[PDB]
Amino acid sequence: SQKSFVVSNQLREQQGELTSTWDLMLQTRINLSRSAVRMMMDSSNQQSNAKVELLDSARKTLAQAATHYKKFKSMAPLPEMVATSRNIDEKYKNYYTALTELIDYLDYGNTGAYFAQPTQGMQNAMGEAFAQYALSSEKLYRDIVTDNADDYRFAQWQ
Amino acid sequence: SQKSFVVSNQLREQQGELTSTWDLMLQTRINLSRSAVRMMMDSSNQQSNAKVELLDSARKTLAQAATHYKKFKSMAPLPEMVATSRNIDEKYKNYYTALTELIDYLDYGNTGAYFAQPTQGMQNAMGEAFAQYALSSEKLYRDIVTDNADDYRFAQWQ
């Protein structure tokens, strides 16, 4: 099918990869918090072992998030999506770096530095960026498939 | 026309409400864990004082999740989506109930009951169900927009 089908499909797949990225960043946050609460309990016998398996689960979900994000970046943007795509990038790198620092803080037993990070603010900023992306994508998508402004070229360095 | 557009747009809106539902269940899980961790810092701290605020934030996100799910349910399924919708309902109800039970334990500071509840498997089952839904929807969407339509009718109700 059709070249507008390729373009419209691309927008849905880009959204799908960002959805997966965001989901897996949230799962990373959950896993890290589960690890932290284990480290705040009377140690060994209970946990001290669990805390490690949970931190490893956080590493895994975060690597999966980064994989989805790389797949996102592999799909050329529509020119009208470049600005919101860059805003996604800015917030993603900040939250991704925040979660990698959390992993590190817990890996060395540093719950104080874990609690000290303003993680929630960075999560919220990503969430809001992801929402603005989805608004812009959906409105372009409508234009494309009702011919109201296909575009209909990918960004490219011609 | 276009009725084809009404149907395809419906599939996308349904996927969007389920995405919002899942996102907000995960944020509930995060907020619950952030509350639980503060319930274990306890005493002076400063960090601990937010334990009730965080549990309230969890109540908020879970209620938002339920609202998105109600919106999902407001949109009549196509017959081809009924089975996977029912599977989503099952896994949603189990995970929603799990989260509410976590809330009710932390309501009284019952962190041992909170830790004992086997939440992670219900979370995972929900996640799998959402994945399966998303794949079936996308496949159906592609069938719909590549024609023929005609053709696609919403569920009837007698």
Swiss-Prot record, chains A, B:
Native organism: Escherichia coli (strain K12)
Taxonomic path: Bacteria, Pseudomonadati, Pseudomonadota, Gammaproteobacteria, Enterobacterales
Protein name (record): Methyl-accepting chemotaxis protein II
Residue segments, region The 3 Arg may form a positively charged pocket, which binds the alpha-carboxyl group of the attractant AA: 29-38
Full-sequence portion shown in this chain: 36 to 193 of 553
Gene: tar
Highest rank taxon of the organism: Bacteria
Family of the protein in this entry: Belongs to the methyl-accepting chemotaxis (MCP) protein family.
Periplasmic compartment residues: 1-155
Reported function: Receptor for the attractant L-aspartate and related amino and dicarboxylic acids. Tar also mediates taxis to the attractant maltose via an interaction with the periplasmic maltose binding protein. Tar mediates taxis away from the repellents cobalt and nickel. Chemotactic-signal transducers respond to changes in the concentration of attractants and repellents in the environment, transduce a signal from the outside to the inside of the cell, and facilitate sensory adaptation through the variation of the level of methylation. Attractants increase the level of methylation while repellents decrease the level of methylation, the methyl groups are added by the methyltransferase CheR and removed by the methylesterase CheB.
Entry's localization field: Cell inner membrane
